[PDB]
Amino acid sequence: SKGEKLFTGVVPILVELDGDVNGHKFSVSGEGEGDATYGKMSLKFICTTGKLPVPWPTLKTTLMQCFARYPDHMKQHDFFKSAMPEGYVQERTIFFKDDGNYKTRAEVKFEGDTLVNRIELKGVDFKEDGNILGHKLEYNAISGNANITADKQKNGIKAYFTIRHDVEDGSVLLADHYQQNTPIGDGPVLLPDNHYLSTQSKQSKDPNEKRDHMVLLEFVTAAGIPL
């Protein structure tokens, strides 16, 4: 594969999410730019249906690991770019401790020069008086590691990690992520040695934006193999 050559410059990003959580339906759209040379994504997401019925932080991991910076010595472990431009399917289950779960399915692919992330999200067994449907989570930055492993049987990768969401009562809401990625195309892909993606995030608002929205500046770096 020569998928990595598609990311050497600034790439426009389009995101589309259709969600249903305990029957509360919503849509999100997002745009921005990825600059994988520096591991960077600059993004803005809008709830297109009015008020988001779950907190923005709970959707962040769902709303493009193809934009990670793999250091030169780790290039042979970058499944995400190797699958381009045909793309990959990303599936997760996210278990919120003592609350419901999200089941997600996404297709991440190029549509001409645009990297498009099209997502379906289904959430069930949430508590209406809980920290999620009750909107009791802090609007702050999520940072941390995604652990990546080869899935030889599916010619893809699996990932796992736990996000710690701050609750406005000073407690923490744990969100256990289980991830599977499979190439959409039939061509060759890179199957990695074990490693992780480290994300640094800055979360903000646009003071001119009336719509329910999220602004992110993300930097994502591959790590866990020396040299």
Numbering used by the authors: 2 to 64, 68 to 231
Cite, word for word, the article reporting this structure.
Recently, a fluorescent protein based on an anionic tryptophan (Trp) was developed and was named WasCFP. WasCFP was further improved to enhance its stability across a broad range of pH levels and temperatures, incorporating 13 additional mutations. This improved variant, which exhibits strong green fluorescence under physiological conditions, has been named NowGFP. Spectrally, NowGFP exhibits green fluorescence (λex/λem = 493/502 nm) at physiological and higher pH levels, contrasting with cyan fluorescence (λex/λem = 429/475 nm) under acidic conditions (pH < 6).
In the case of the orthorhombic (P212121) crystal form there are eight molecules inside the unit cell, and two molecules are in the asymmetric unit (chains A and B). Similarly, we refer to chains A and B in the orthorhombic form as Orth(A) and Orth(B), respectively. For the comparative study of the two crystal forms, we chose the orthorhombic crystal structure obtained at pH 9.0 for comparison with the monoclinic structure since it has a higher resolution (1.7 Å). Two of them come from the arginine–aspartic acid salt bridge between Asp180 of Orth(A) and Arg168 of Orth(B). The other two are from Tyr182 and Tyr164 of Orth(A), which are connected to the main chain of Val176 and Asp173 of Orth(B) through hydrogen bonding. Compared with Mono, a significant shift of the main chain is observed for residues 170–176 of Orth(B), which mainly involves contact IIAB and the loop between the β8 and β9 strands. The evidence that Orth(B) has a more unstable structure compared with Orth(A) or Mono is that the r.m.s.d. from ideal angles, average B factor and solvation free energy all show the highest values for Orth(B). In the case of the Orth(A) and Mono structures, the key residue Lys61 has ∼80% k1 conformation and ∼20% k2 conformation under a high-pH condition (pH 9.0).
